[PDB]
Paper text:
The eukaryotic guided entry of tail-anchored proteins (GET) pathway mediates the biogenesis of tail-anchored (TA) membrane proteins at the endoplasmic reticulum. In the cytosol, the Get3 chaperone captures the TA protein substrate and delivers it to the Get1/Get2 membrane protein complex (GET insertase), which then inserts the substrate via a membrane-embedded hydrophilic groove. Within the membrane targeting stages of the GET pathway, the homodimeric ATPase Get3 (also called TRC40 in metazoans) adopts closed and open conformations in response to nucleotide load and interactions with other pathway components, allowing binding and release of the TA protein respectively. However, the cryo-EM structures and native mass spectrometry of hsGet1/Get2 and scGet1/Get2 show they form a 2:2 heterotetramer, which is stabilised by Get3 and interfacial lipid binding and is important for efficient TA protein insertion.
To understand the molecular function of helix α3’ in detail, we now investigated the effect of a polyglycine substitution of helix α3’ (Δα3’)24 on the structure of the human GET insertase. As previously for the sequence with native helix α3’ (referred to henceforth as ‘wild type’), a heterodimeric fusion with the flexible N-terminus of Get2 truncated (hsGet2ΔN/Δα3’-Get1) was purified and complexed with apo hsGet3. The complex was subsequently reconstituted in PMAL-C8 amphipol and a single-particle cryo-EM reconstruction was refined to 4.2 Å resolution. Interestingly, the membrane-embedded region in the Δα3’ structure shows pronounced differences compared to the wild type complex, with density for only seven of the twelve TMDs in the hsGet1/Get2 heterotetramer. Rigid body docking of the hsGet1/Get2 model into this density revealed that only one hsGet1/Get2Δα3’ heterodimer half is resolved and adopts an identical TMD arrangement. Notably, the structure reveals that the Δα3’ variant causes a complete repositioning of the resolved hsGet1/Get2Δα3’ heterodimer within the complex. Superimposition of hsGet3 between the wild type and Δα3’ complexes highlights a twist in their respective interactions with the hsGet1-CD, with the coiled-coils being rotated and tilted by ~15o between structures. A model for the missing hsGet1/Get2Δα3’ TMDs based on superimposition with the resolved hsGet1 coiled-coil suggests that the membrane heterotetramer has a converse orientation to the wild type GET insertase: the hydrophilic groove is rotated into the heterotetramer interface, whilst hsGet2 TMD1/TMD2 are moved to the periphery of the complex. Instead, the N-terminus of hsGet2Δα3’ TMD3 abuts hsGet1 TMD2 of the opposite heterodimer, burying a surface area of 190 Å2. Interestingly, the hsGet1/Get2Δα3’ reconstruction contains an unassigned rod of density in the central membrane cavity, which points into the hydrophilic groove of the resolved heterodimer then extends diagonally towards the luminal side of the membrane.
Author numbering:
A (entry chain B): 23 to 108, 140 to 190, 220 to 344
B (entry chain A): 23 to 108, 140 to 192, 216 to 344
C (entry chain C): 1028 to 1124
D (entry chain D): 189 to 234, 254 to 291, 1005 to 1124, 1149 to 1172
Write the structure that this text describes.
Amino acid sequence: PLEPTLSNIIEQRSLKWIFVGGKGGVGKTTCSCSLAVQLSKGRESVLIISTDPAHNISDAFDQKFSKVPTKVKGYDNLFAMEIDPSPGIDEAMSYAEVMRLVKGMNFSVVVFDTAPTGHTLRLLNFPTIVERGLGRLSKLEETLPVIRSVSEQFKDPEQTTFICVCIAEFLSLYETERLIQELAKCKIDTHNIIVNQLVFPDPEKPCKMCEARHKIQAKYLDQMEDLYEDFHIVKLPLLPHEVRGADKVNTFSALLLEPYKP
Amino acid sequence: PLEPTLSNIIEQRSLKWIFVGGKGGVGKTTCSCSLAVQLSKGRESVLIISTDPAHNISDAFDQKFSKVPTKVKGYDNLFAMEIDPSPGIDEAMSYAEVMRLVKGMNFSVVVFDTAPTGHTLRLLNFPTIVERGLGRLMQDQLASKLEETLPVIRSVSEQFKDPEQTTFICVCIAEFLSLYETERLIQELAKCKIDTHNIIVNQLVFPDPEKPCKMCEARHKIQAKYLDQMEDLYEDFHIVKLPLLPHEVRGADKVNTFSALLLEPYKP
Amino acid sequence: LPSFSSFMSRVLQKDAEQESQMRAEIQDMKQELSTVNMMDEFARYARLERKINKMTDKLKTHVKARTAQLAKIKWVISVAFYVLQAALMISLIWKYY
Amino acid sequence: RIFRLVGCALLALGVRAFVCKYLSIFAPFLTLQLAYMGLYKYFPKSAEVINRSMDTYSKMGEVFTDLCVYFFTFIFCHELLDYWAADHWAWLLVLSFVFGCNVLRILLPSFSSFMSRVLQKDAEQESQMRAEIQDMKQELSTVNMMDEFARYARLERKINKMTDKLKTHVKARTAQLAKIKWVISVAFYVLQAALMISLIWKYYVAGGVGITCWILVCNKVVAIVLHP
Ligand SMILES: [Zn+2]
C-alpha cells in the first residue's frame, strides 16, 4: 500500500527536475514552495521557477523578484525566479536562452510550477519536428544540442518526475485521471498525487454539514486509494485561515515528512 | 434585480421540452423531480423522462419502472420513464419511436434529465444531413422507415430551436472548474442556437454565528466571491439559488421542500 | 482488380475474424460501462477505459502498419500494371515488325 | 550515388569522343560492357520478390537514360562537322519545344503567385483581422482566472467570435482559388497535349518514339537536377 510520506522523492539524488501540476482551486504555489523548502535541507541549492501569471510566490514570500534568479530573504540556499515569457521560432529561442541560463547556474534541482492549462514541456517537442523539416531543405544548429540534452533529461524516468495535485471532487478526480494517462502516454514518469484541502473534524464540533461533507470526502478518498495503490498518497489537511505567510509555509511543509495526526 | 425565481418557466403555456443538464455531483435528477412536481400543479399532465444510468428516480420514489409510462402513487399526473438503450437508421428509428409515444398521448410538457457525459440534442443534425443525401442519391421496409422519420425528425426539430417553447436549464456548483465547465457549455449551446434563461446553483452552505466553526466561514467567503462574480457575468440569465439541505430527510419530503424553495424566493 | 481483391480478402480472413471478435467484445464492455455507475464504481470504470485505450491504440497502430504493407502490395501490382503496358507495347512492336 | 552518375557522364563524354570514329563494329557490345562495369561495381559498394521489384524499376530508369545518351553521342561529334540540312534544324526545334513545355509546368506556380492580384485585397483585410486577434490574445494572457473570470470569458468569447469569422473568410478564399488553379492547370495541360498532337501531325514510327525519348528520358532528368 506504500506510506503517506514523500520519502522516495526526498531520498534520491539523480532527480534534477520536479514538475508540479493540477487544475482547480489548488494551492500550487503553496505546495511548490513547500516541497522546495523541504528539499533544500537535504540538497545543496534549489531554484524555484514559476509560470503562473498570478505570481503567488511574491505573495507568499513578501519580496519582489524579476527575470533574474536571486536569493531569498530569511534563507541561505533558497533561490527564486519567475518568467511570464514562458512564428514558432522566437518562443523556442527564448526558452533555449532560459535553459542555457539554467545550465549555467547548474543547480542540482530546478523545481517548476506549471500553470493553469496543461504542461509546458509538451509544447517544447514541437520545434524539433519542424526544425528537422526546415533542415531537409545558423542559430538553430547551436540551439539543437541544448535541447536534445534536456530532451534526454526529461525522457529519463530517473532524473525527472511529476507530482500531480488534486482536490476530493469527482470532476477533479476524472481530470487528474486524464492527466495521468496523457503523461504515461507521452512517456514521462510519476509517483505522486498530493491531495489538498482536507477537512478533519472532531466530535467537539456539533456541526452537521462538517459531518455530511466528512463522510462524502472520506468515501471519495477511499475510492481514491483503491484506484492508486501503485502510486503513493499524501494526506494533507486543510489549514485554518488563521495563519498565512512564512508561518504557514513552514508549518505546512512540516506535514510532508510525518503522517498527519488530528 | 432580475427575479431570482423561475416564474417565466412556471407561467409559460407553450413549453414542451425543458432540458436539464450540467456536469458534477449535483443532484440534477432531484432538481428535475422538484421542477416536475411543481409544474404539474398548474398544468394538466407532466411526463418525466430519464437518461442517467443511476436511475436516481428509483431511490427518490421507492417504485420500479420500465420502458413504458407509468403513474406514481400520490400523484395523478406525474408519469415515470427511463431508457437504458438510450445502425444509424435504426438509431433514428428508436428515437422516433420514443418521440411519437411520448408526444401522442396528450402530453403538454416533456422534461429531460440528460446524462453527465455528452449531449443528445445536436444528434438531430445527423438526420437533416441524411435528408439532403437521400434526394441527392436518387438524383422496401427501409424506404418506408426513412419516410416515416424525416418529416417527424424535422418537425420535432423546430420546436427545439424555437426560443419560446424549448428551454434549457443548466446547473453548476460554486467552484472554479465547474463554473468554467458550465460557461463553455452555455457558449457552445448559444453557438448551436438553443434558448436558455436559467442557472440553478446548488450545495449552498448558510452559516450563522451560533456555529463557532471556522471552515463554515472560510468556504462561506469562497462561495460569496464565486457566486457574485457569477451574477456579474450572468446578470441577463435568471439566477435561482437553492440552499443545501441537511442529511435527515431524503425522499418525497426533500422533493417537496426543494419544490417550495424553488417556487418562492429563499430567505434564511 | 476484383479477382485480386477476392484473393487478398480470402487470405486476410484471419484479420477479418480477429478484428471482428475484438471490436465485438469492445462494444460488449462499452455497453457494460454504460451500465456502470459514475459514483460508486469509478475505480473499475477507470480500469475499463484504460483497457479500451490500450487495446484500441495498439491494434490500431498495427492496422496502420498492415495498411502500409497493403499499399506496398498496391505498388507491386502497379509495377505489374506497368509491365502490362510494356507488354502491350512490345505487342504493337511485333504487330509492326 | 551521385558519383556513379557523374561517372556515367564521363562515360558519355568518352562515347562522344570516339564511338562515331567507328574504329570497329562494336557499338552495342561496348555499350553493354561499359554498362557491365558499373553493374558489377554496384555490388562491392552496396519478400524476395519485393526486393527484385524495387531494383527492376531503378535499373530500367537508369539504363533507359544511358542507352539513349549513347545515341546523343552521335548527335554532337557531327554537329561540329556540319559547321566544318533541314534535319539539323528539325533536331534543334524540339529543344525549344520542350524548354517551353517545362517552363510552363514550372510557370504554374507563377499563376499561383499571380492569384495575388485579388489576394492583396484579401490580405489587407485578413491581416488587419489577425492584428486585432493577436493583440487581444496577448492582452488576455495577462489576466488571471480565480479573481477575473468575468474579463477572461468576455475576451475569450470576443476573440473566438472574430477567430471563427477569420477562419471562414480564409477557408472560402482558399477553397475558391484552389479550383481556379485546378482549372487553369488542366487548361494549359491540354494545350501542351495539343502541341504534341500538332507536332505529331507536322511529322505525320521510329521518329515518333525517338521524339518521345528526347522530350522525356533527358528533359525529366535535367529538371530533377536543376529544379528538383
Ligand atoms: Zn462546520
